[PDB]
Amino acid sequence: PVLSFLYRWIYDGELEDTYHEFFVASDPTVKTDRLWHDKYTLRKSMIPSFMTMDQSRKVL
Amino acid sequence: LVSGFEATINKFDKNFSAHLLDLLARLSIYSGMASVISRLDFNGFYTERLERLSAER
Amino acid sequence: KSPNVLLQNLCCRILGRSEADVAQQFQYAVRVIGSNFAPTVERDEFLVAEKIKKELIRQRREADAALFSELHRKLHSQGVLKNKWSILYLLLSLSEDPRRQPSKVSS
Amino acid sequence: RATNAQFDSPEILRRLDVRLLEVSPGDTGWDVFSLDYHVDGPIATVFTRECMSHYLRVFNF
Amino acid sequence: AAAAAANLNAVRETMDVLLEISRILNTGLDMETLSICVRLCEQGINPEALSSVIKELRKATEALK
């Protein structure tokens, strides 16, 4: 399932999780020019160990 | 008769000037958008000769 | 304290003259304050605060405009005045441009 | 119209507009006149608010 | 009381704060005249009328000359 969360976050920026199983930390109701500034925060517990930090800063 | 002509013309002239200045005052609040004020007095007469002084309130 | 002698102290603060020297000005002073004892414009201390701020931005003293936010805070902190909007408008109505102000007062 | 800046594309000519910085009697006309040149669209993410405030200080000097 | 005397110290502070606001807004008022105006605003008064008072009283001292 993380290879169905790290195989569509690479391509089309499509994600949906209810309980957080991935390092996307959304901020609600941000669709303006603060979208380039927010709605994403690199949560540091949902990054798997075979990845590295640069891989996770790129997909975001 | 010049009370049926000239005095009546002056009464109408007074009322027309009053309506005109009230129109220009109520038109100045409205923000080619200000061309409506410019066209009516392009020479610059009959427009805001008095500012309507502020009271001691 | 009664307001009529309290207004009589005001006319001897602005004028240098005594109250047995002039009573003609003070009669005119009650003529303007009286019957205009309730607000002739609507109140908000928020808008008047943003116009003392916009004046300090106009002078590019914008470190003092955020020091002013603590000066607007102190007036709320006592809470004995409810006409906090009025006295800020009063210094704003009598405001002029120094082009700059240096050596700050308060505390 | 009298000077040569009318070779500009219409967008930036529409984006600029005179900005007032508040009436204060005793203040000459030179100190309150500055253009705004606001910015909207997707390009506004590069030109943040803090950038515009610092440009206003540069203009005032 | 005691808190009713500590607030007198704190309004003595507030008058100096308003004096700083008076000098950065460049108004010719001192600590003493503002102390009349705060007591007037306690009873409730218009700053629009006080501004007209101050603009007339300073411009009628050469009319009592």
mmCIF file of C-alpha atoms in Angstrom, chain A residues 23-42:
data_model
loop_
_atom_site.group_PDB
_atom_site.id
_atom_site.type_symbol
_atom_site.label_atom_id
_atom_site.label_comp_id
_atom_site.label_asym_id
_atom_site.label_seq_id
_atom_site.Cartn_x
_atom_site.Cartn_y
_atom_site.Cartn_z
ATOM 1 C CA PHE A 23 4.389 12.195 5.259
ATOM 2 C CA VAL A 24 1.894 14.644 3.719
ATOM 3 C CA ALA A 25 0.588 17.025 6.401
ATOM 4 C CA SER A 26 -2.270 18.980 4.848
ATOM 5 C CA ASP A 27 -3.609 22.326 6.042
ATOM 6 C CA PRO A 28 -7.369 22.626 5.377
ATOM 7 C CA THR A 29 -8.879 25.226 3.001
ATOM 8 C CA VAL A 30 -5.652 26.322 1.297
ATOM 9 C CA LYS A 31 -6.274 26.637 -2.463
ATOM 10 C CA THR A 32 -5.127 30.260 -3.000
ATOM 11 C CA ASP A 33 -1.541 31.578 -3.504
ATOM 12 C CA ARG A 34 -0.775 30.181 -0.033
ATOM 13 C CA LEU A 35 -0.991 26.742 -1.681
ATOM 14 C CA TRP A 36 2.580 27.205 -2.857
ATOM 15 C CA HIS A 37 3.487 27.986 0.772
ATOM 16 C CA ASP A 38 1.369 25.521 2.753
ATOM 17 C CA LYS A 39 -0.762 22.337 2.699
ATOM 18 C CA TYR A 40 2.475 20.287 2.868
ATOM 19 C CA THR A 41 4.769 19.512 5.803
ATOM 20 C CA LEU A 42 7.328 16.692 5.865
#
